[PDB]
CSV table of C-alpha atoms and ligand atoms in Angstrom, one decimal:
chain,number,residue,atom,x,y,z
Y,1,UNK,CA,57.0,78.2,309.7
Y,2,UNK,CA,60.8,78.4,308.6
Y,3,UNK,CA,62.0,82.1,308.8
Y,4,UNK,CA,65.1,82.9,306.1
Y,5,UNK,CA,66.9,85.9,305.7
Y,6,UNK,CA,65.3,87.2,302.6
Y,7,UNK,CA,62.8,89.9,301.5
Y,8,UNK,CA,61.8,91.0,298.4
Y,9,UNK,CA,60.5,93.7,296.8
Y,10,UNK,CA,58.2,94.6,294.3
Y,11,UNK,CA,58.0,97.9,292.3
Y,12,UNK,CA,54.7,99.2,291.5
Y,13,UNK,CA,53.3,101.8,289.2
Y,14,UNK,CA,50.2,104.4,290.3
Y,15,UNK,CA,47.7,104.8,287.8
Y,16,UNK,CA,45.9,108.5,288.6
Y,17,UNK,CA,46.4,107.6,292.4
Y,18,UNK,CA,43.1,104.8,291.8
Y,19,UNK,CA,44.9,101.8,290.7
Y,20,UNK,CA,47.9,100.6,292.0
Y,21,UNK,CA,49.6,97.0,290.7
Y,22,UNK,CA,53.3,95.6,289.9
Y,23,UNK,CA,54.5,93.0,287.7
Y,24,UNK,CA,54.4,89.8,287.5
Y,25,UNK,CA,56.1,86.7,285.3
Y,26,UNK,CA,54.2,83.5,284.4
Y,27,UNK,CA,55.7,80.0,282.7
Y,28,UNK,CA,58.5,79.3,280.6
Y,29,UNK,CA,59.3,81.5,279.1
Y,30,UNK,CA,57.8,84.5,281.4
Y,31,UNK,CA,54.8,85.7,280.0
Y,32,UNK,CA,54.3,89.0,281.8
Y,33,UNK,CA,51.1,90.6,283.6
Y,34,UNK,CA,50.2,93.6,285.6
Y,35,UNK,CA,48.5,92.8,289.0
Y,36,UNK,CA,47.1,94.6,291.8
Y,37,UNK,CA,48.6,92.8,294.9
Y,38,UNK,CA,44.7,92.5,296.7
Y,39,UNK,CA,45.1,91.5,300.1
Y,40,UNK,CA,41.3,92.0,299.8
Y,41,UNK,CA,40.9,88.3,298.3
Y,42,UNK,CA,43.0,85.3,297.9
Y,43,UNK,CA,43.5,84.1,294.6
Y,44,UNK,CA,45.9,84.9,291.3
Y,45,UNK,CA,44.3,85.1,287.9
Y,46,UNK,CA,45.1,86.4,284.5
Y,47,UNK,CA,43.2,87.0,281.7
Y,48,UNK,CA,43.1,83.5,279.2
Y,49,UNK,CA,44.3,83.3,275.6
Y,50,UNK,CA,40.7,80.8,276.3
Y,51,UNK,CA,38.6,84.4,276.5
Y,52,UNK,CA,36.3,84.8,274.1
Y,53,UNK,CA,37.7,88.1,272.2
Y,54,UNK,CA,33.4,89.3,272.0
Y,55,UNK,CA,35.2,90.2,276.0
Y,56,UNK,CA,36.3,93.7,275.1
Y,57,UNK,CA,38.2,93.7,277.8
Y,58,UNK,CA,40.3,90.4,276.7
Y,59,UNK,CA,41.0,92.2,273.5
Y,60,UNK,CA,42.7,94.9,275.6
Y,61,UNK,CA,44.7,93.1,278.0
Y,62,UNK,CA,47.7,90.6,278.1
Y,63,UNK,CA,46.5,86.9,278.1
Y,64,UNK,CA,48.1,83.7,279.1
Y,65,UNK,CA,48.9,81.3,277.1
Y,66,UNK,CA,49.2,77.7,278.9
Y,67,UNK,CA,50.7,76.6,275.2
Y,68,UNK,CA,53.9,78.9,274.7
Y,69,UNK,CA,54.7,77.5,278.7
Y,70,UNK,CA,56.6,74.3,279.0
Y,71,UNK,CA,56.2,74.5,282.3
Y,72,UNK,CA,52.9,74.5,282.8
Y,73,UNK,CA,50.4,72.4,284.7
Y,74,UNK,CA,47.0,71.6,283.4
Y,75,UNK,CA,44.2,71.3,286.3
Y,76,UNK,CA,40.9,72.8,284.6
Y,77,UNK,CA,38.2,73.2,287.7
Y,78,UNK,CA,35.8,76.0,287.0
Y,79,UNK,CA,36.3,78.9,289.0
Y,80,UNK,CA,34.4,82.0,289.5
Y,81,UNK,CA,35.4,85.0,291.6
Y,82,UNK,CA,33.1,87.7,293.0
Y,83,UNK,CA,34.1,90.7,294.4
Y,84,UNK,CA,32.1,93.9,295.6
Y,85,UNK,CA,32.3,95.4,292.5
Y,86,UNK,CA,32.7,92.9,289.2
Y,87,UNK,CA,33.1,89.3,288.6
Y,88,UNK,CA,35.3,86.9,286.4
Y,89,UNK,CA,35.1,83.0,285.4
Y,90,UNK,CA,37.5,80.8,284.3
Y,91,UNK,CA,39.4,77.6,285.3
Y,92,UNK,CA,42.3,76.7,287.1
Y,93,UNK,CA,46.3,75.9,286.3
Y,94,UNK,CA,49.5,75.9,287.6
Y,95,UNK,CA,52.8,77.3,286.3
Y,96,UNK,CA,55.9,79.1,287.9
Y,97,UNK,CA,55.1,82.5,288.7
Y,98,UNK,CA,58.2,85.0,289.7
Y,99,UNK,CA,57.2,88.1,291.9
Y,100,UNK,CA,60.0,90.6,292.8
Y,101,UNK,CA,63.0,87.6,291.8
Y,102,UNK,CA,61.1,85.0,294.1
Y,103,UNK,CA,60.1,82.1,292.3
Y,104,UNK,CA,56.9,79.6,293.1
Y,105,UNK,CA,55.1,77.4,291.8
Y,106,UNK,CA,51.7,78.7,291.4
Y,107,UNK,CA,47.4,77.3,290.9
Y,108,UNK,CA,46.1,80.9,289.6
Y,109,UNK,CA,42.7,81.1,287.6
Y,110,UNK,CA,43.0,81.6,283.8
Y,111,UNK,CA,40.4,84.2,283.5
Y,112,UNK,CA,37.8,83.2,280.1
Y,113,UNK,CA,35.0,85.6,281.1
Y,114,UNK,CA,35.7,89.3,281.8
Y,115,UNK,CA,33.3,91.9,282.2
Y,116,UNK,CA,33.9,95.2,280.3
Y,117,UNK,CA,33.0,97.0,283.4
Y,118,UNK,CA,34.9,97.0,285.6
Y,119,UNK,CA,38.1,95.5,283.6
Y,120,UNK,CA,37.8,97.4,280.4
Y,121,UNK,CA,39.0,100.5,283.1
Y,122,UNK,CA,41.6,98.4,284.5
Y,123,UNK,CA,45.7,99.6,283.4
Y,124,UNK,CA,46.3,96.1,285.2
Y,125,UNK,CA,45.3,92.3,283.4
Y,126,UNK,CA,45.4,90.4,286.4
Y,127,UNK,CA,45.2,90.2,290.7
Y,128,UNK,CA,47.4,88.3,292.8
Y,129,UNK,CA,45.3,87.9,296.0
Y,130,UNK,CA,47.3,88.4,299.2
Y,131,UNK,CA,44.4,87.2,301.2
Y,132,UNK,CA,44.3,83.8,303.8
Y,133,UNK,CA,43.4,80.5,302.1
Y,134,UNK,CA,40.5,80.8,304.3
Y,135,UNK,CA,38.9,83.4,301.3
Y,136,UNK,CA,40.7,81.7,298.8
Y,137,UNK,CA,37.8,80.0,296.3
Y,138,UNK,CA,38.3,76.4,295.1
Y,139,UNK,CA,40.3,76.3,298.3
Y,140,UNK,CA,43.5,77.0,296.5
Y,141,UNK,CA,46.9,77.5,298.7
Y,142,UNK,CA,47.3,81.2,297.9
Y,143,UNK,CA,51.2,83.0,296.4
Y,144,UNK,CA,52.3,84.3,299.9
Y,145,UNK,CA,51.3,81.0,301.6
Y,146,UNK,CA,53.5,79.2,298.9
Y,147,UNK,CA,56.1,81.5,299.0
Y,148,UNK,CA,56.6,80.9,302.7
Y,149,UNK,CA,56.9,77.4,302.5
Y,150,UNK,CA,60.0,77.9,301.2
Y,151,UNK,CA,61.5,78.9,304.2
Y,152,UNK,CA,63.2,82.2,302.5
Y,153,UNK,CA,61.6,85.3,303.8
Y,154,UNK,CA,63.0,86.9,307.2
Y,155,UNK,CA,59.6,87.8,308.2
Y,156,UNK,CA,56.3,86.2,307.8
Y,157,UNK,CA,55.0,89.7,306.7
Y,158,UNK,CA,54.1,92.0,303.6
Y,159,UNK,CA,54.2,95.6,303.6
Y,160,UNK,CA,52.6,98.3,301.4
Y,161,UNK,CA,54.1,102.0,300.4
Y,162,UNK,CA,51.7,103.6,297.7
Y,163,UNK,CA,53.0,107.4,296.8
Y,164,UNK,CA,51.2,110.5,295.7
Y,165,UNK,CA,52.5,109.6,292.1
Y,166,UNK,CA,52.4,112.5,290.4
Y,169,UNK,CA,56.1,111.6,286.4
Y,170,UNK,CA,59.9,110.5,287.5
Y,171,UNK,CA,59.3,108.7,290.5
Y,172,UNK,CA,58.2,105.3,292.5
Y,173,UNK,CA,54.3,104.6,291.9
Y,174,UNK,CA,54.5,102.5,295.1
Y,175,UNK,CA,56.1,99.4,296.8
Y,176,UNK,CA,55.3,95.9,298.2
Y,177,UNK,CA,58.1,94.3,300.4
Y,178,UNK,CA,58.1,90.8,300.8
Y,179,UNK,CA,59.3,89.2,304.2
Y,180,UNK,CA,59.6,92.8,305.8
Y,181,UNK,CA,59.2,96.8,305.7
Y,182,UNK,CA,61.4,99.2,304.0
Y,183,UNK,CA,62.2,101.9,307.2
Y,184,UNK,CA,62.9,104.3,303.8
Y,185,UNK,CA,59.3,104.8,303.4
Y,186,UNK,CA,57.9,105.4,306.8
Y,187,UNK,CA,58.5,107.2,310.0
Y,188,UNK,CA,57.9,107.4,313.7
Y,189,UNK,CA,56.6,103.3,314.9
Y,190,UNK,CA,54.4,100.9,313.6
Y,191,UNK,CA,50.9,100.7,315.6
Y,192,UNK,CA,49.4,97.2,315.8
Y,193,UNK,CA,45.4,96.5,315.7
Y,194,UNK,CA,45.2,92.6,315.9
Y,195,UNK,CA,42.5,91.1,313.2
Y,196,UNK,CA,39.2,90.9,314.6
Y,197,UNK,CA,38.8,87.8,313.0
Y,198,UNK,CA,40.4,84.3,311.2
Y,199,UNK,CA,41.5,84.9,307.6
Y,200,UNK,CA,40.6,88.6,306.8
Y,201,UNK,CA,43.1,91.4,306.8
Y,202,UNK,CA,39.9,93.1,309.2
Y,203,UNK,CA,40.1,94.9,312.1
Y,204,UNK,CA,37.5,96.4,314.7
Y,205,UNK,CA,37.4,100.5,314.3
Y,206,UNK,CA,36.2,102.4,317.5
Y,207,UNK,CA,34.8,105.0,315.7
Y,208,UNK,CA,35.2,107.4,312.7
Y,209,UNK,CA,34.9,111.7,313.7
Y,210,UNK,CA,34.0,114.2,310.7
Y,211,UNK,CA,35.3,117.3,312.1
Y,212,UNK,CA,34.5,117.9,315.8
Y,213,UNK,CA,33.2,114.7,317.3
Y,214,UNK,CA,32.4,111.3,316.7
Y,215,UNK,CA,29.7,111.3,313.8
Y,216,UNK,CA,30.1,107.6,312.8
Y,217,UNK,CA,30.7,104.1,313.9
Y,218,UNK,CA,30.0,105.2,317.7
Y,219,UNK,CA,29.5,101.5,318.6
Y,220,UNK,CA,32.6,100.2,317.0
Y,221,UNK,CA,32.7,98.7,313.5
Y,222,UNK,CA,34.6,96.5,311.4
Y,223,UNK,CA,37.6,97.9,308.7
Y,224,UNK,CA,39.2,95.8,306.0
Y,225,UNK,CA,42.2,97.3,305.0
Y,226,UNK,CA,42.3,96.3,301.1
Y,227,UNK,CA,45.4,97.5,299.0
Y,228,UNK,CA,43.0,96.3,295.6
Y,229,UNK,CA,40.6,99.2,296.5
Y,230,UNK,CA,41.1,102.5,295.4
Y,231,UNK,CA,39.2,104.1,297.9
Y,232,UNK,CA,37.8,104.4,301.9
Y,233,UNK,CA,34.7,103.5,301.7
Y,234,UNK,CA,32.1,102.5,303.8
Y,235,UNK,CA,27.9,101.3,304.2
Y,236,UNK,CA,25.6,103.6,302.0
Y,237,UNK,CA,24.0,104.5,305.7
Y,238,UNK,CA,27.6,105.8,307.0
Y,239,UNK,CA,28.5,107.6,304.0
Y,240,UNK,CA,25.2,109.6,303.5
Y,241,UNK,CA,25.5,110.6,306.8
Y,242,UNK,CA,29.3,111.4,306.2
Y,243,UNK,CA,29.0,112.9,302.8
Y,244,UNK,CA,25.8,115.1,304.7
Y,245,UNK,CA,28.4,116.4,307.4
Y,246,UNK,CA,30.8,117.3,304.1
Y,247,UNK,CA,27.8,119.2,302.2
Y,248,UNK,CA,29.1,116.9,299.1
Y,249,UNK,CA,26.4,115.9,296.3
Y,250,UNK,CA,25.7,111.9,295.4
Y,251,UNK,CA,26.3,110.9,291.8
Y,252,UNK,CA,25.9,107.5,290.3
Y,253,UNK,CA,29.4,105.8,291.6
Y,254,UNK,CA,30.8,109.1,293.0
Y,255,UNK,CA,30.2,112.0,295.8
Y,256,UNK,CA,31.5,115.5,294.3
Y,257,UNK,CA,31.3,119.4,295.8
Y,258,UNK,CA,31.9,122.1,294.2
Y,259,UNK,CA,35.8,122.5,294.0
Y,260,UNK,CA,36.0,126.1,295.4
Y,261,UNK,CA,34.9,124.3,298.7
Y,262,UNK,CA,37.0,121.3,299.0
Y,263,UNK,CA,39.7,123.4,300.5
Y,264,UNK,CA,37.3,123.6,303.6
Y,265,UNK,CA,36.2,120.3,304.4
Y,266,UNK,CA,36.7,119.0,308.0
Y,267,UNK,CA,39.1,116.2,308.7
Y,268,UNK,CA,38.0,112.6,309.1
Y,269,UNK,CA,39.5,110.8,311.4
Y,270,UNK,CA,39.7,107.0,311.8
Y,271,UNK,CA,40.1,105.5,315.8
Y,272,UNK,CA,42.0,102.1,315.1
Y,273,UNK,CA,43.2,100.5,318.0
Y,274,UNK,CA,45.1,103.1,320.1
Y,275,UNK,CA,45.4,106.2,317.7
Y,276,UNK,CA,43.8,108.0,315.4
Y,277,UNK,CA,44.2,107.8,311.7
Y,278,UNK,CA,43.5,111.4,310.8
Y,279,UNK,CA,42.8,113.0,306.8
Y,280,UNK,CA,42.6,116.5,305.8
Y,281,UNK,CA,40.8,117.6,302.8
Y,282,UNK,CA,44.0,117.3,300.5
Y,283,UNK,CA,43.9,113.8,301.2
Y,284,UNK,CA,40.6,112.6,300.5
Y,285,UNK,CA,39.4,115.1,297.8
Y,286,UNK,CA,40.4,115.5,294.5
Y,287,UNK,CA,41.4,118.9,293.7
Y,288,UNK,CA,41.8,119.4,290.4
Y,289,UNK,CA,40.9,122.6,290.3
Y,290,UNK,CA,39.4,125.5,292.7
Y,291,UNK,CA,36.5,126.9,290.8
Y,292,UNK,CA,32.7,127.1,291.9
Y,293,UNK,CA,32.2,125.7,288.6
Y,294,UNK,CA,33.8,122.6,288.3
Y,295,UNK,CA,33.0,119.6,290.3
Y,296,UNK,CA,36.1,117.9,292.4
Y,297,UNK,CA,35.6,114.4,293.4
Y,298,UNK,CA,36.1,112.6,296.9
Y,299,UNK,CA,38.1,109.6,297.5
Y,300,UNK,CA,35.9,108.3,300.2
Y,301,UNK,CA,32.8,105.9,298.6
Y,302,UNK,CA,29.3,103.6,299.5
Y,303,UNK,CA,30.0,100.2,299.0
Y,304,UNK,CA,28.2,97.3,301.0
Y,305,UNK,CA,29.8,94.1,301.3
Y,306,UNK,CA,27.4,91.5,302.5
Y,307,UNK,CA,28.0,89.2,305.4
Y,308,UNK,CA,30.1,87.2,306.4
Y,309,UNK,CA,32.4,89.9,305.7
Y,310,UNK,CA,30.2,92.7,306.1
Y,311,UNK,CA,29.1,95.0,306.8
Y,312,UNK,CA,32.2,96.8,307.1
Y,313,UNK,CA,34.1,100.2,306.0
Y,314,UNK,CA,37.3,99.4,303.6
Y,315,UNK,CA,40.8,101.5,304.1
Y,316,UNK,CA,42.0,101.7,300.5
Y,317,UNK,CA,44.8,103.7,298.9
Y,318,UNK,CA,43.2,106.7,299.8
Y,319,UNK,CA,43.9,105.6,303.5
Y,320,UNK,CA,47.7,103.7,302.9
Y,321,UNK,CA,48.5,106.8,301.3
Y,322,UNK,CA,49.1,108.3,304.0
Y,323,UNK,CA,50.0,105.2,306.6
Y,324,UNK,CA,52.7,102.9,305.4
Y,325,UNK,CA,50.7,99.2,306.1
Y,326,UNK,CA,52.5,96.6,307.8
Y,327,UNK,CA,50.1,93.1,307.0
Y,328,UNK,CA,51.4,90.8,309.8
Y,329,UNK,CA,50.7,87.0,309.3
Y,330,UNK,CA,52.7,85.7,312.0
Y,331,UNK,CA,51.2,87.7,315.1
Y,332,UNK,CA,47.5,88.0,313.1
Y,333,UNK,CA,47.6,91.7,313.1
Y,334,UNK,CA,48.3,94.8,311.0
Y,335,UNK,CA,50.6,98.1,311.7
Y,336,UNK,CA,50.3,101.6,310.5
Y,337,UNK,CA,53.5,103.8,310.3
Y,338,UNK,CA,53.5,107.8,308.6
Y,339,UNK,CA,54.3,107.2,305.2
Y,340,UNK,CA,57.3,109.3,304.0
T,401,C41,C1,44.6,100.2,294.6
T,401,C41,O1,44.5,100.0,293.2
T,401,C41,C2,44.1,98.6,293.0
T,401,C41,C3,43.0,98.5,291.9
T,401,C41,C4,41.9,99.5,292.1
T,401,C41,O2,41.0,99.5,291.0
T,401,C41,C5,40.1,98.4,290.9
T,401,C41,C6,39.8,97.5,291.9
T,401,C41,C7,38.9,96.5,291.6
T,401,C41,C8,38.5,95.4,292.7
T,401,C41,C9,39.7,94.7,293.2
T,401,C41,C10,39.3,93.6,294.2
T,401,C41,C11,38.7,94.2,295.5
T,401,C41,N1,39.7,94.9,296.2
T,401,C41,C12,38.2,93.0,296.4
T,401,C41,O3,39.3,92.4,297.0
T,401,C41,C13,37.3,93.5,297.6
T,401,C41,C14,36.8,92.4,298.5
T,401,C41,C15,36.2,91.3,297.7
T,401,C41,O4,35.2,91.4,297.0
T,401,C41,N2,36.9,90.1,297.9
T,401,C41,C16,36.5,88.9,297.1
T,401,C41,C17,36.1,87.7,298.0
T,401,C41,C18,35.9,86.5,297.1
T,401,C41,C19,37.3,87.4,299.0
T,401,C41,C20,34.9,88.1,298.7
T,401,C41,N3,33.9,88.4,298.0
T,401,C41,O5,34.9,88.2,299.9
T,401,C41,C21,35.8,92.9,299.6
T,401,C41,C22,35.4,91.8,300.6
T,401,C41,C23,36.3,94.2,300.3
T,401,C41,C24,40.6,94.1,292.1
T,401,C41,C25,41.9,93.5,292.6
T,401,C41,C26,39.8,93.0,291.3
T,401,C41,C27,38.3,96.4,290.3
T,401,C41,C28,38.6,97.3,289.3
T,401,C41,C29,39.5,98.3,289.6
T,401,C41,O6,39.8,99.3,288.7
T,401,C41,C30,39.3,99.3,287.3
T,402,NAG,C1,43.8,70.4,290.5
T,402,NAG,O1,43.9,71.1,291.7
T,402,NAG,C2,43.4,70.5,293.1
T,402,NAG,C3,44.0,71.4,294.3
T,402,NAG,O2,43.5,72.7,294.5
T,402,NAG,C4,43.6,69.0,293.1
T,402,NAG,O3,43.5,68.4,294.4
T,402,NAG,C5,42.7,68.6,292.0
T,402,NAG,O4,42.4,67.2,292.1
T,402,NAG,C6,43.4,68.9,290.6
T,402,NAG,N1,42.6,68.3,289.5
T,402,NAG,C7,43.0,68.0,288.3
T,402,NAG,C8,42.1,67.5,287.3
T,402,NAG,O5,44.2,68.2,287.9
């Protein structure tokens, strides 16, 4: 590991507070994409000028392709990528990608299959995984790892700053190498990862309200910056969303929006504090009538072992607490978000 005196940082833009992503330049020329920086997996990929346009969603988003790029890199293994909630194919290349003025030579997917749900929702094309190697699939040295190895960044560390984006303003912002002091206050809190090559940590216990409702024997919590939401097992969050009186919908929990004013916080006990929401943060409150129904940023979603069962902090939870992702000590900070 050779430390440098660089950081860099990357501007990003918030799409209705659920998707957050930056930009992103690939070959030579630069074709441009927009990614969401996922420290929830480990690999890049963009949709292909390869994808079949009968994949609505390749009609509708910026495609790479490998001939305009003179510098690119022909490799071809198949590559499939599964997350918790949709799946793309393709194959693998290599090219020059620049993030926020760094520049690295990059194996990313070329994306020839792409589900209309859940891309044909997505404002970005692509994903730039800022997961370890060790979830990388096809084994592929991920961007940070290769961005380190040139010995430029001050810090082996990334940091994430996603705002309440609401027209003239800064969607969000990922710092390279470092933090940005500008965007948080008080000090960081350290929980060190639970485990090798998963930005997871163990969470002592989540508390609806009064007491401890949930996770009373200590649970795992990924904090992923590609999810637009908490969420956690379908048995948690029935017995959450019971405590909250809200009603289960198909991919959603609502209540009615005169009530969402009223709901109890939630707190989160990670490491030695507690990560505490109000209402405001976690419900949607679009309006305050009986008879509309206002939507709640906390969701069900089981990941299957190894990896779960576990909750997931998303931008409903790095709203409010600037994330420090810390490579070089294996562990992860929270700081207030200003
Ligand atoms: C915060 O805004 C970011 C985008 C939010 O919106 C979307 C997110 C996804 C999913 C994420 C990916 C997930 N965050 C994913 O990383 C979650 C993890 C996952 O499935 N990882 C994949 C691997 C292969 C590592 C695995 N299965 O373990 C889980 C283990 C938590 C995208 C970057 C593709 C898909 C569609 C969206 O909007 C239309
Ligand atoms: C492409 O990439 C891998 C590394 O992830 C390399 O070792 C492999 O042999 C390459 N294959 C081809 C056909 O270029």
């Amino acid at each position: 590991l050779t430390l440098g005196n660089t950081t860099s940082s990357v501007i990003l833009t918030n799409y209705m507070d659920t998707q957050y992503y930056g930009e992103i330049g690939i070959g030579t020329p630069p074709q441009t994409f927009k990614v969401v920086f996922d420290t929830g997996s480990s690999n890049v990929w963009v949709p292909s000028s390869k994808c079949s346009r009968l994949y609505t969603a390749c009609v509708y988003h910026k495609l790479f392709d490998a001939s305009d790029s003179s510098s690119y890199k022909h490799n071809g293994t198949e590559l499939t990528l599964r997350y918790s909630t949709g799946t793309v194919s393709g194959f693998l290349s290599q090219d020059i990608i620049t993030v926020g003025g760094i520049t690295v030579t990059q194996m990313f997917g070329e994306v020839t299959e792409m589900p209309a749900l859940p891309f044909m929702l997505a404002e970005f094309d692509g994903v730039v995984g800022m997961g370890f190697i060790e979830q990388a699939i096809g084994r592929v040295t991920p961007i940070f790892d290769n961005i380190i190895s040139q010995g430029v960044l001050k810090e082996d560390v990334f940091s994430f700053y996603y705002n309440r984006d609401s027209s003239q303003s800064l969607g969000g912002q990922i710092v390279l190498g470092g933090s940005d002091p500008q965007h948080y206050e008080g000090n960081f809190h350290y929980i060190n990862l639970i485990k090798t090559g998963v930005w997871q940590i163990q969470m002592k216990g989540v508390s609806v309200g009064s007491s401890t409702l949930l996770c009373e024997d200590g649970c795992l919590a990924l904090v992923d910056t590609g999810a637009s939401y908490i969420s956690g097992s379908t048995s948690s969050i029935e017995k959450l969303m019971e405590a909250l009186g809200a009603k289960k919908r198909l991919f959603d929990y609502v209540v009615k929006c005169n009530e969402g004013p009223t709901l109890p916080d939630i707190s989160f006990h990670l490491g030695g504090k507690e990560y505490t929401l109000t209402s405001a943060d976690y419900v949607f409150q679009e309006s305050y009538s009986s008879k509309k129904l206002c939507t709640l940023a906390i969701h069900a979603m089981d990941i299957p072992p190894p990896t779960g069962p576990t909750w997931a902090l998303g931008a409903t939870f790095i709203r409010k607490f600037y994330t420090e992702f810390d490579r070089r000590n294996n562990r992860i900070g929270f700081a207030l978000a200003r």
